RNA sequence: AAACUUUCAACAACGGAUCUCUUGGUUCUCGCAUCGAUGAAGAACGCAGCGAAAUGCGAUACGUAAUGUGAAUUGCAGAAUUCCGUGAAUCAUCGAAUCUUUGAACGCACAUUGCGCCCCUUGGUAUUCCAGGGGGCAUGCCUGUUUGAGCGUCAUUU
RNA sequence: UUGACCUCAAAUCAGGUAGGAGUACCCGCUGAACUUAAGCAUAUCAAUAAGCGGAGGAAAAGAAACCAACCGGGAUUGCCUU
RNA sequence: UUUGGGGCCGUUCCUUGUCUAUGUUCCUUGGAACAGGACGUCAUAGAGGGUGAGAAUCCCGUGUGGCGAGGAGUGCGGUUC
RNA sequence: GGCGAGAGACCGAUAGCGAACAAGUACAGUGAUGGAAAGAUGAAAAGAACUUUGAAAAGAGAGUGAAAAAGUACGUGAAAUU
RNA sequence: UCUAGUGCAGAUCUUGGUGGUAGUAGCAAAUAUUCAAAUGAGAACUUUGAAGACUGAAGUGGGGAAAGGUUCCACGUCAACAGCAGUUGGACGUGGGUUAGUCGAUCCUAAGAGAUGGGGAAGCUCCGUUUCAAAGGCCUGAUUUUAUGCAGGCCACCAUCGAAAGGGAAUCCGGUUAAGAUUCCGGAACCUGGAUAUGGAUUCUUCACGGUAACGUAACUGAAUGUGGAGACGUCGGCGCGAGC
RNA sequence: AGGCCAGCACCUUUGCUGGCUCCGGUGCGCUUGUGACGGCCCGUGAAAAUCCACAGGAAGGAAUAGUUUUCAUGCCAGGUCG
């Protein structure tokens, strides 16, 4: 909704900060077993339910 | 078997009173001192419909005899009762149509 | 790099708050060109130093107070010992230790004494 | 028309998050937690929830303080500093 | 245009830049973005200029 | 006769069994006793030169101080005085601190980042208005202090 | 009139204290049914699970208003047995 | 007939640090020797782990003892008021 | 249960705690609650410079490696099925 | 020799994987598309132009509430998704973007929820909401050790929550962005709260005049207490007036 | 100001200069607001915050000078969230 709280308005920011894939020299690490982000949400597959 | 009818009213939950347009409990004036020793006047302003009841309701104004104050009170109109009519309400009142005595 | 506290420690209140404000002067003038440039790791130093500094000015300043109470009963929340609720709660070696005259006269009457078997 | 079309009239939520758990377990008209039992003072637990209390107990989070009392402990709940030996 | 704490409030701001920055503030607009960061739009009087001042904090 | 179907083999596929590995689990034994109003457990939001997590931390924010070891960290960048030294390190130890918003959660409320009261101070020509800064205001119960209430009640007044 | 006593109050009075978490083990309250009985009602499951209150490193119990009937033993707890 | 409390240094307990042996000699295979064979050493240490393949002897450790540091403490062992 | 230790004729990734991995995670449900899958290149990335066909992905060569019958769809690589 | 979680073809067995069916059923509601050029490796589907059509104002339009949460806008861009395609995209990657004294929330009370006091209940907790309570704060100063007690007087509802459609102090035009606007710029206003000085009004009949009156005016003392009004109100019918069309 | 036009300028930021923006009418029209009425009810169709007025007459007040800030003008500020 338009007319919202700000603990909506601040979850939202922090999924939107989420929203991302990998960073890539994560990839080039020692020991590295992290390929792909798999907490990834999108607002047509997933919703937060908040 | 199941819990009838008349057993579920007693719970008042949706079988409460509707009171929002009721103008009060329509109660006789409290039994101070002046009604047991002489009579107190008051005034008939208005005869209002109650929702919830046929018969109409007066609200009658007295003087508060400790307080500079004007407590109103509200009766059950009895047939010939009008506005402006003076109720006078005690032991030594009249007997007239809308006296308490 | 950045400051180090032994050579902080020497100084009084008021340097230290001077100090203070010309390390933050510098990290407002290091993230303005944080946004311009790639990369700026100096930024990480001064928020260390800032830390330091604001370390060794509540040190200075609880000092004082614990000074200021000194010696007497009651003194603040923050300068007593935490160890835990029922700790602190508990009696202490002193209260623990009271018996009564009876008790007293008889541990040193009957005390437990050192006995050997052997004749 | 019980399914699929009854399943679009539904756009107001009977629970929000919850201050205490952060959850959307808070119901908006009994105004208390689903799970935590917020504003009750005690934390809502039953013993035939085994997962829930697993979920919810100590160790799953940050333990901010209680860490470190086992540390506090082994050296005794001393007080003061080292000395430079 | 600055990035302000979400704990300010415009008396703060109108303050602060009063004080860093050695200016007389007209009027100050806040919102919150989508990232959970506070924008302040700082309105100087005729008298001050933004654009000199903004090379002198050290971007343009 | 070819194509097609079927069967077998070789190679290639599909798939992920078997074999071999194991910073994990399970059970037995031993030792110890340590959460919290001095604000616990839990939760939310943030914090890195380049991180979404996990882990760590709290506007001193993958950490400050102290102590020990004694030259690293590492994916890249960058840094060098930090290298025969009060000194590197995502090091270990840890006794000093910081510890947002909360939470038994404590000014009143909370589906609000809502609404107050008191003290000190600063500013705006201000005991009163506005704002900023710091510090406070829960409930029950105990000990005590002070102020009081009651023809409950004693004495003493003229 | 003044000053006491008694009982009851108010204070952001001076100092403290309780709450919640955890809950394997511990002290209590409350309290089923499935089940077994080849059916079922007492019974059994069980003075169990679930629910509630309350602790510690153990708790509880404990120095006999005990056991006995012996040529008598001698707080409590636990094991072997009975 | 018999008596109390303090101090000091030890011991007791807790925690922690550090030091304390002997081959990486020869040939073959192999990408790599920690494999095979030859000659040896240490062993109150041939437990375990690591290292480019099964390593006592390469590293950490292990075993045996030693030298410290910090606490709690009234348990006792001496000394002093 | 918590902290700290030592062991096993235990299980060995469809097993063993649900979880050997960013697991009470992702995800589902209004909610109470429910609840996964998923380990292995090689000693070392030495993770394929360069040529050529192609819009590119890729291919063919070349090259690294002991081995590309180890090419991040990576140990071995069964069967169904093709 | 010891030991057992020891032998699979079945259990509408469990988990995982794979077939035939089969390039098969089918991808047919919502009137409808066509031509050229550009782009590009590539165009039935992208863009532009031209044409032909539809929704037809109780719209396939312009806005909003709930809900969603960045889907908005730009740039780059096609391995997957968009059950054909794809150079396009609510997809992918990287960033930008939501400006208020006047709009809402905030405040009020509604149905109702719900502390305190007290009372029940082994108890988690229940009742109840003004009650069988010693349930508070409001104006003016007096003193000028001085800060604010005592001097006075007043007053008795007795928490709090509960509406982004009810109640409610106060804003409009024009312009501006890739994407924001009653919020930004310009100009022109208004309300509340607080300080305050001048002018004006009033007074030597101290707290104004006029009007027969209805009433009028630039103003033209007024505490406690009390009263009254506004807030504050159904539905239908026709008639009248206005505004926009 | 906005709208509709004309004219003259240019790699271009691109404009610049002139004009008009007027006077009416109609109605069981549409929509909407409002007013005064009428009809209906055994239905008579919220409350509070908040604001004003009145009654009263406490108290305070002028002449060589006072009182008034519901008149006018002037000064400052207007938070948080969306
Ligand atoms: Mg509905
Ligand atoms: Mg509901
Ligand atoms: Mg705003
Ligand atoms: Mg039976
Ligand atoms: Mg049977
Ligand atoms: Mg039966
Ligand atoms: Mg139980
Ligand atoms: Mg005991
Ligand atoms: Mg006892
Ligand atoms: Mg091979
Ligand atoms: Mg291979
Ligand atoms: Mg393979
Ligand atoms: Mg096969
Ligand atoms: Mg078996
Ligand atoms: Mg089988
Ligand atoms: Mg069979
Ligand atoms: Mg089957
Ligand atoms: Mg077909
Ligand atoms: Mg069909
Ligand atoms: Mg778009
Ligand atoms: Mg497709
Ligand atoms: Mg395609
Ligand atoms: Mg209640
Ligand atoms: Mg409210
Ligand atoms: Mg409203
Ligand atoms: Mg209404
Ligand atoms: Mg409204
Ligand atoms: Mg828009
Ligand atoms: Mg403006
Ligand atoms: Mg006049
Ligand atoms: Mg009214
Ligand atoms: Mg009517
Ligand atoms: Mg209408
Ligand atoms: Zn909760």
Redesign the pocket.
Same mark, same amino acid.
């Given at each position: 909704?338009?007319?919202?709280?700000?603990?909506?308005?601040?979850?939202?920011?922090?999924?939107?900060?989420?929203?991302?894939?990998?960073?890539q020299?994560?990839r080039?690490?020692?020991?590295?077993?992290?390929?792909?982000?798999?907490?990834?949400?999108?607002?047509?597959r997933?919703?937060?339910?908040? | 078997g199941r819990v009838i009818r008349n057993q579920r009213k007693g719970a008042g939950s949706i079988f409460?009173s509707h009171?929002?347009?009721r103008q009060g409990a329509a109660k006789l004036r409290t039994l101070d001192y002046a009604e047991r020793h002489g009579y107190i006047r008051g005034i008939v302003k208005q005869i209002?419909?109650?929702?919830?009841?046929?018969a109409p309701l007066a609200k009658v104004?007295f003087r508060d005899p400790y307080?500079?104050?004007?407590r109103?009170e509200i009766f059950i109109a009895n047939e010939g009762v009008h506005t402006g009519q003076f109720i006078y309400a005690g032991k030594k009142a009249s007997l007239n149509v809308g006296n308490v005595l | 790099?950045?400051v180090?506290?032994?050579?902080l420690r020497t100084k009084s209140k008021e340097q230290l708050a001077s100090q203070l404000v010309d390390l933050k002067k510098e990290l407002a003038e290091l993230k303005v060109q944080?946004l311009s440039r790639?990369?700026?790791?100096?930024? =990480?130093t001064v /928020?260390?130093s800032?830390?330091?500094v &604001?370390?060794?000015?509540?040190?200075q300043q609880?000092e004082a107070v614990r000074q200021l109470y000194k010696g007497k009963?009651?003194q603040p =929340?923050?300068? /007593?010992?935490?160890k835990?609720?029922? &700790?602190?709660?508990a009696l202490t070696?002193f209260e623990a230790s009271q018996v009564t005259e009876k008790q007293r006269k008889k541990q040193?009457?009957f005390?437990q004494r050192?006995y050997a078997i052997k004749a | 028309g019980k399914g699929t079309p009854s399943f679009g009239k539904?756009?107001?939520?009977?629970?929000?998050?919850?201050?205490?758990?952060?959850?959307?377990?808070?119901h908006?008209?009994?105004?208390t937690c689903?799970?935590?039992?917020?504003?009750?003072?005690?934390?809502?637990?039953?013993?035939?929830?085994?997962?829930?209390?697993?979920?919810?107990?100590?160790?799953?989070?940050?333990?901010?303080?209680?860490?470190?009392?086992?540390?506090?402990?082994?050296?005794?709940?001393?007080?003061?500093?080292?000395?430079?030996? | 245009?600055f990035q302000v704490?979400?704990?300010?409030?415009?008396?703060?701001?109108?303050?602060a830049v009063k004080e860093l920055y050695e200016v007389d503030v007209?009027?100050?607009?806040?919102?919150?973005?989508?990232?959970?960061t506070?924008?302040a739009?700082v309105?100087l009087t005729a008298d001050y200029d933004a654009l000199d001042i903004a090379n002198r904090i050290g971007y343009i």
């Open positions: 909704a338009a007319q919202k709280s700000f603990r909506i308005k601040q979850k939202m920011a922090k999924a939107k900060k989420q929203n991302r894939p990998l960073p020299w994560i080039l690490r020692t020991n590295n077993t992290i390929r792909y982000n798999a907490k990834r949400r999108n607002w047509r997933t919703k937060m339910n908040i | 409460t009171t929002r347009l209002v419909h109650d929702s919830g009841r046929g104004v307080k500079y104050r004007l109103e | 790099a950045g180090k506290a032994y050579e944080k790639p990369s700026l790791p100096k930024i =990480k /928020r260390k800032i830390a330091c &604001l370390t060794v000015i509540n040190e609880r009963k009651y =929340k923050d300068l /007593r010992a935490k835990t609720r029922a &700790l602190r709660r070696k040193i009457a005390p050192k | 539904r756009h107001n939520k009977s629970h929000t998050l919850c201050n205490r758990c952060g959850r959307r377990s808070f908006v008209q009994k105004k689903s799970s935590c039992g917020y504003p009750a003072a005690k934390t809502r637990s039953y013993n035939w929830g085994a997962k829930a209390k697993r979920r919810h107990t100590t160790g799953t989070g940050r333990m901010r303080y209680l860490k470190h009392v086992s540390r506090r402990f082994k050296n005794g709940f001393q007080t003061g500093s080292a000395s430079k030996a | 245009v704490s979400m704990k300010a409030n415009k008396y703060q701001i109108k303050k007209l009027k100050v607009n806040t919102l919150v973005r989508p990232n959970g506070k924008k739009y309105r």
